[PDB]
Design a protein around this ligand. Sequence first.
Ligand code: HEM
Ligand code: HEM
Ligand SMILES: CNCc1cccc(OCc2ccc3c(C)cc(N)nc3c2)c1
Ligand SMILES: CNCc1cccc(OCc2ccc3c(C)cc(N)nc3c2)c1
Ligand SMILES: C[C@H](O)[C@H](O)[C@H]1CNc2nc(N)[nH]c(=O)c2N1
Ligand SMILES: C[C@H](O)[C@H](O)[C@H]1CNc2nc(N)[nH]c(=O)c2N1
Ligand SMILES: [Zn+2]
Lengths: 407, 411
Amino acid sequence: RFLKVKNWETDVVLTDTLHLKSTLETGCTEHICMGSIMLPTKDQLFPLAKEFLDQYYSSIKRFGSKAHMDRLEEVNKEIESTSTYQLKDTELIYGAKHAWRNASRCVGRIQWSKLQVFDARDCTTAHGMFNYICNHVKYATNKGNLRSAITIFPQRTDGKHDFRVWNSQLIRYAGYKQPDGSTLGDPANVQFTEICIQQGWKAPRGRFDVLPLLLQANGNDPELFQIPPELVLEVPIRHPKFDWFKDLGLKWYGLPAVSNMLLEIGGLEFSACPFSGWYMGTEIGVRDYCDNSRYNILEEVAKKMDLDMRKTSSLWKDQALVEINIAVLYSFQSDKVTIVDHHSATESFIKHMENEYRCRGGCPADWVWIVPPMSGSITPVFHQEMLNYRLTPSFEYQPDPWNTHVW
Amino acid sequence: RFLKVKNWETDVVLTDTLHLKSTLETGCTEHICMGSIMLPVRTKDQLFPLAKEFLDQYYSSIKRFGSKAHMDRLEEVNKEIESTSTYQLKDTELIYGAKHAWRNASRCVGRIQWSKLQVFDARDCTTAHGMFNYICNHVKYATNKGNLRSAITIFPQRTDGKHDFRVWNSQLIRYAGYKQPDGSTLGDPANVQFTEICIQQGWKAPRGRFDVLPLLLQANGNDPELFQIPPELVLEVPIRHPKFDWFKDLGLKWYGLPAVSNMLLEIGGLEFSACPFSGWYMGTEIGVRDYCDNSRYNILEEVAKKMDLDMRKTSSLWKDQALVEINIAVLYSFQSDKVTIVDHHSATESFIKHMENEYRCRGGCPADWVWIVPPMSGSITPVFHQEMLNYRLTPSFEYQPDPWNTHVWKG
Ligand code: HEM
Ligand code: HEM
Ligand SMILES: CNCc1cccc(OCc2ccc3c(C)cc(N)nc3c2)c1
Ligand SMILES: CNCc1cccc(OCc2ccc3c(C)cc(N)nc3c2)c1
Ligand SMILES: C[C@H](O)[C@H](O)[C@H]1CNc2nc(N)[nH]c(=O)c2N1
Ligand SMILES: C[C@H](O)[C@H](O)[C@H]1CNc2nc(N)[nH]c(=O)c2N1
Ligand SMILES: [Zn+2]
């Protein structure tokens, strides 16, 4: 029950004890592994509060101190009275950083302690939310020198007063379904693009139209806001060898900022907590550009390369995939917009695993997500055994708002 | 209890009932997933239900469940167990067992082929020389002048664990590896330990970069003996690239016949510790892992140099670019020499169709995503976007310790 993990490229073996602190469940059993499945009250709240506070006061070397006990007492009192409780600023910041630390699917976690936390808990309106989000975006973008950030809106109370950002990312391109049958723009967003238009948005019906924010404060109907264009940094995608590449018409945004997840700290639920870092190249070039149910540009790019697309065994798809990802990295780098290639990021993650095993006793990690979608085994994480388990505080998935919202 | 998996590229949803038949354990708990851990003397006591479960499966597949033939067989095995503490499989049962072991192999992407398996019954074998003869015929049959045929050769089952048959080679055909005094390795670094054993056992090593290893064969618990596969039986392929003529000069070749010989076949509780099986290669097995793993031949550097790529920063993706050409060259060379092979696109597409079929005719298809997804270009193959359920069915192929670690030396 003190588990070992082996790197089969380097024979390095790490011992994991951290997993015994795990509370939440995996979806696996001794009879069946679900490792590749995408999505598996007052009395409830105080153990959760206590556990979080216990680990917080341990992290600041004040375990079993007056200040510890006093706070445990104080929150315990407050839970009894208000049926909920509030996080001290210090606890908020700790919780946020540690949620990221504990994100078993994030390869970028070597950066986990350098997170900028924006406390938006005083927010009351969608316009307010828009202002906080604009400041987030401007701060994180930093004229291309990106900085990790999170903006935390008021915690859930009775589920009828939820703060939600309806967009899946703060910045995403619209998706429209043509009469001719195909799809213009990003097919991942067709349903949301509809709901935007279905709510008032006037679409340019272009291929790369930045979606409007759809913001929901205190459980009210969500409101549309347009992000100032000057705050949305975009990178024109060109190849460093192929001059025809610019003519493909491709660009992407610099800021990956996920906005549909739920942040859980000490049992408190933050349904609206958009957070952002910077991209790994493959996220755009492999997934966003070449996934079949996305921009799926593979065929057109290969045709420009004049490859033998007759037989699959020419690996033309593979060739094109590489070149596309070469371009993406090259474009960002050229415009001094922060980006990391999958070799650099996976090497960082191994060093980070080392650090976490050494200073924390382990690092929960989901091999199925950590290994990049291209060139898997020539990255170090492929040969790295990983233990997946769920630590708290955490980022969790939550239902799409339109399925839930009582209009 | 029913269970659903979803393809996120196609939104196809499948329902698994087959996982209910699963007996063996996964390594996982509700509190931990061991899904990426590589590897997570049996008495009459526990053997009969294992026999009964197998025979129940067997007679179901032949639509004779509860027939007199079924019951008599059950009776027959029962008595034979308590009388002799083990039992023998019929030919039909052995063939069924082998095919289903492959069908149940959740880490194998090539199972669309599972029903076309040539089973060679080598249970009458008694000596290493007899093992060598059987293995020779396997290789010739399977190789078929390049038109590869799946085959498995099954040697006598374990009895008291003190008389095991084992093939000490991990594969029937593999290249030697030699550690040099300067710390570099000549040949295949994956086979250095086993090469050393062979040398110690009296093998005279040519000491080149592609020396086919001798067979080291153990019959009936005896010390293993060395044998050289006749070269004319070992089909090899010079690796060249269709556009890069300097590629031939890298000096690479590979053997055509992937034949794994270190695994254990379990059927109805019986253990077959020597059961070499072979198919044909998926290109990436050679082009990605065998050539480009840092701990293998590791040719990325030389290939990248020869292509004149910007090798100064990794963000140039010179590694990725070289990987692709190398895998192109492997496919090109094999197809040119009419030696059976399959690229990762074809094989993954076939697996999805197989898997879908298995869900409909069988109620499930256990699959290990970590192993099924190819080691390059993962997300542009359709298995990447496919949710999979991993669980263990019998008959099965199992890992077993390396024999040099467990063997009692007679002298
Ligand atoms: C700073 C650079 C960062 C990099 C390079 C990075 C990289 C990645 C990548 C490649 C994924 C795979 C996601 C996918 O394929 O869709 C991922 C997932 C994830 N990241 Fe990170 N990330 C970074 C920062 C952050 C930050 C600041 C947070 C939170 C504060 C975060 C939280 C997460 C979470 C929760 C997931 C999993 C989401 C899910 O389960 O769907 N990341 N990350
Ligand atoms: C006929 C063409 C076949 C193809 C293309 C194929 C393909 C593969 C590949 C690519 C792997 C992963 C190999 C690795 O990365 O080490 C694998 C694993 C495996 N294959 Fe197949 N295979 C074939 C035939 C067979 C046959 C005939 C058997 C047995 C009768 C078999 C049983 C297995 C087993 C048990 C594994 C898992 C090995 C392990 O757990 O370490 N395969 N196969
Ligand atoms: C579509 N894949 C499932 C899914 C659902 C919800 C959010 C998802 O986002 C993944 C994600 C989240 C955060 C990221 C951050 C902060 C940076 C980054 N480079 N990539 C990320 C990637 C993915
Ligand atoms: C050292 N890698 C783990 C390992 C240990 C023992 C056997 C292993 O076999 C993988 C395997 C087994 C059978 C294969 C067959 C029959 C065909 C094929 N193309 N590849 C195979 C690949 C792998
Ligand atoms: C750590 C990890 O389980 C290990 O490297 C696995 C990953 N997936 C694999 N998949 C295949 N097909 N072959 C392998 O050898 C491995 N190795
Ligand atoms: C079905 C499968 O689990 C699904 O495609 C996963 C696989 N691994 C992934 N890995 C990352 N980083 N991102 C993803 O969206 C996925 N999708
Ligand atoms: Zn699992």
